[PDB]
Amino acid sequence: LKEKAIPKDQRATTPYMTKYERARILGTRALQISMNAPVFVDLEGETDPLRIAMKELAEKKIPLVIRRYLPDGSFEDWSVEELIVDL
Partner 1 sequence: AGRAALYKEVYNVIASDGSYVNYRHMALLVDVMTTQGGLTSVTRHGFNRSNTGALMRCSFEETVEILFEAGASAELDDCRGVSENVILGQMAPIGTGAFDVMIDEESLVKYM
Partner 2 sequence: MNVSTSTFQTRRRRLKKVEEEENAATLQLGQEFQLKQINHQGEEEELIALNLSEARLVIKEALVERRRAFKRSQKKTREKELESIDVLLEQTTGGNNKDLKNTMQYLTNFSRFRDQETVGAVIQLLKSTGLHPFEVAQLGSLACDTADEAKTLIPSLNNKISDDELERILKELSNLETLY
Partner 3 sequence: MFFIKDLSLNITLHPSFFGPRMKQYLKTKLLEEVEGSCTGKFGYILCVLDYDNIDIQRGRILPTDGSAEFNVKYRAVVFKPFKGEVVDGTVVSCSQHGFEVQVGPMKVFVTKHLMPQDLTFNAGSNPPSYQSSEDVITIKSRIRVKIEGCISQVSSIHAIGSIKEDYLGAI
Residues near partner 1 (CB under 8 A): 20-21, 23-25, 28, 40, 61, 63-69, 77, 79-81
For residues 46 and 77, which CB has a smaller minimum distance to partner 3 in the complex?
Answer: 77
What's the maximum distance between 2 C-alpha atoms anywhere in the chain?
Answer: 47
Taking contact as CB under 8 A, which single stretch among the options 1-9, 19-27, 35-43, 69-77 is the one that binds partner 2?
1-9
Rounded Cα distance between 46 and 39, Å, is 12
Question: Considering the rule CB under 8 A, would residue 67 count as an interface residue with partner 3?
Answer: yes
- Please say which residue, 77 or 81, places its beta carbon nearer to partner 3: 77
Q: Is 18 in the site for partner 3 (CB under 8 A)?
A: no
Report how far residue 44's alpha carbon sits from residue 41's, in angstroms, rounded to the nearest whole number.
9
Q: Please state the closest distance from residue 33 (CB atom) to partner 3, in A.
A: 9
For the CB of residue 29, give the shortest distance to partner 2 in the complex, in Å: 27
As a whole number of angstroms, the distance between CA 5 and CA 40 comes to 29
Contact (CB, 8 A) for 24 and 61: no
CA atoms within 13 A on the CB side of 77: 8
